[PDB]
Amino acid sequence: SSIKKISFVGIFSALATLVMFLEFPIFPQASFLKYDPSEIPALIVSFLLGPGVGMFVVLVKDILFFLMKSGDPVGIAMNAVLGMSFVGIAGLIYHRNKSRATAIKGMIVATLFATAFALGLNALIVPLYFEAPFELYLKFFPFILAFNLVKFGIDSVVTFFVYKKVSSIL
Numbered sequence: 001s002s003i004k005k006i007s008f009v010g011i012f013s014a015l016a017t018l019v020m021f022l023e024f025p026i027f028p029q030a031s032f033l034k035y036d037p038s039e040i041p042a043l044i045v046s047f048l049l050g051p052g053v054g055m056f057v058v059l060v061k062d063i064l065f066f067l068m069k070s071g072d073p074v075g076i077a078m079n080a081v082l083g084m085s086f087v088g089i090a091g092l093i094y095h096r097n098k099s100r101a102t103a104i105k106g107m108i109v110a111t112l113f114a115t116a117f118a119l120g121l122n123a124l125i126v127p128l129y130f131e132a133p134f135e136l137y138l139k140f141f142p143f144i145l146a147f148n149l150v151k152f153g154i155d156s157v158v159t160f161f162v163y164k165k166v167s168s169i170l
């Protein structure tokens with residue numbers, strides 16, 4: 001039944017939006033970087049149903065969060081762009097031969113791409129957002145690499161240990 005999958009997707013974008021209110025800065029200096037575990041639900045959906053569906057969960061969840069927090073379109077756009085890359089790369093790698101090996105490799109390749117991708121965009125957004133010299137991005141660089149690494153690392157480890165316990169329940 002597709003309605004069982006629509007239910008699953010609709011449920012998991014609702015939890016992805018709720019859990020986002022738990023955001024907090026891991027680094028008090030780079031306080032604009034806030035961690036939230038909202039992509040663990042999307043990565044589960046990506047793994048159990050397809051990369052495109054998991055990315056769709058990230059977009060629905062961030063749209064809903066922006067309407068409730070309209071004060072930050074820049075900081076939600078970057079979360080949306082990175083979350084869909086991370087959960088997209090991981091699911092595409094993994095679905096070519098569903099196993100833990102390509103689940104593990106899917107999340108590592110996705111984590112390192114999203115982090116480099118973050119560094120490239122965080123290189124272009126930080127000076128504009130703070131109306132500051134490129135100096136400041138280089139000052140933020142060690143926090144940016146460390147943060148998007150811990151964020152998508154913990155999201156990978158958590159997802160890895162939970163998402164087949166989720167396939168059993170279905």
Ligand SMILES: Cc1cc2nc3c(=O)[nH]c(=O)nc-3n(C[C@H](O)[C@H](O)[C@H](O)CO)c2cc1C
Nearest residue numbers: 032033034074075076078079082118122129148
């Ligand atoms: C300037 C700016 C840069 C951000 N950079 C990253 C990033 O590089 N990697 C990431 O995972 N999240 C990043 N975020 C995600 C951030 O936690 C999210 O957008 C929050 O809603 C910002 O308050 C960034 C946010 C902002 C505002």
